Design a protein around this ligand. Structure first.
Ligand SMILES: O=C(O)C[C@H](c1ccc2c(c1)OCO2)c1ccc2ccc(OCC(=O)N[C@H]3C=CCCC3)cc2c1
Ligand SMILES: [Cl-]
Ligand SMILES: [Cl-]
Length: 291
């Protein structure tokens, strides 16, 4: 369990960013690591086999906006990024989840297209293949995996921001709606802790949110927990040693540098550190410290 860091890749502040930085909860330190080859915001991060993957996003620059179909892998042992096979389609504001060593890329946008499509990456073959599409088009979708089922939560379908959510059952290659959230949320942070799917923050179409709700997969209910200290949309999120960490985002005024940590035992959020600069739209995941 020891020696794992929270990695934050990419993001947005004025333009899309190439930063890869890693935070050590055990000593409070931050490390700046190898930049992404292409700056991206609206990407997702995940880890398989100790390698960190950056999936999708968009490169916003003064010279334009390019939605990304890229999959790039970072090896902490070498501090190097390598390109992997690209997805079938660019996906900005994507959601990803990992089941049994396979990466699922969910939704996202390509220009004015809002995807319902979903595709699955096999690291051992370096190949993507499409799977069944969601029942709803969703960008800014939160994705998490619990008990080898994949959940897609909230987002924006091109017309309305969503409180709906759905679950993918891999052995039937089928999506089914689940109970909708109590709040409309696009760009929320979605993760799994214990037997629940948490949805933190986001934008309800009117304001950035500090509220947080969790879906108990057994009872099929959404319940609010303690709100974050800060309203945040387009936040990064991950879980580490039994606590949720939320990183950055936009509060309606500032791009936040604050990182908050949720303790489910006390139902409290605490501010634990600050990123090196404020940003939104980052990809976040946990793996071993680099060499
Ligand atoms: O609901 C919508 O229509 C789209 C929705 C959104 C959310 C909150 C908003 C909002 C728009 O408008 C002001 O608050 C969204 C959802 C997830 C994202 C993930 C990543 C991402 O990456 C780039 C990025 O961070 N851009 C930011 C620039 C300035 C502030 C907004 C975002 C942008 C995302 C945007
Ligand atoms: Cl964007
Ligand atoms: Cl992961």
């Amino acid at each position: 369990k020891v020696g794992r860091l929270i990695y934050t890749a990419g993001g947005y502040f004025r333009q899309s960013l190439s930063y890869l930085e890693a935070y050590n909860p055990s000593n409070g330190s931050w490390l700046r690591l190898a930049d992404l080859q292409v700056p991206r915001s609206g990407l997702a991060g995940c880890v398989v086999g100790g390698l960190l993957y950056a999936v999708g996003g968009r490169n916003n620059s003064p010279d334009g906006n390019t939605d990304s179909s890229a999959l790039d892998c970072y090896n902490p042992m070498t501090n190097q990024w390598s390109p992997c096979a690209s997805m079938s389609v660019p996906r900005n504001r994507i959601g990803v989840g990992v089941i049994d060593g396979h990466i699922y890329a969910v939704g996202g946008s390509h220009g004015c297209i809002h995807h319902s499509s979903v595709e699955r990456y096999e690291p051992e073959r370096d190949e993507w293949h499409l799977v069944a599409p969601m029942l709803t088009r969703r960008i800014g979708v939160g994705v998490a995996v619990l008990n080898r089922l994949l959940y897609a939560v909230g987002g924006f379908d091109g017309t309305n921001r969503l409180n709906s959510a759905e679950c993918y059952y891999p052995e039937r290659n089928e999506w089914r709606m689940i109970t909708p959230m109590n709040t409309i949320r696009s760009g929320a942070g979605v993760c799994v802790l214990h037997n629940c799917i948490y949805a933190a923050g986001g934008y309800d179409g009117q304001d950035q949110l500090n509220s947080v709700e969790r879906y108990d997969v057994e009872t099929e209910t959404w319940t609010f927990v303690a709100p974050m200290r800060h309203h945040r949309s387009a936040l990064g999120i991950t879980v580490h040693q039994g606590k949720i960490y939320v990183l950055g985002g936009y509060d309606g005024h500032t791009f936040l540098d604050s990182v908050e940590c949720y303790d489910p035992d006390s139902d409290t959020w605490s501010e634990v550190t600050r990123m090196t600069s404020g940003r939104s739209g980052v990809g976040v995941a946990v793996t071993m410290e680099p060499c």
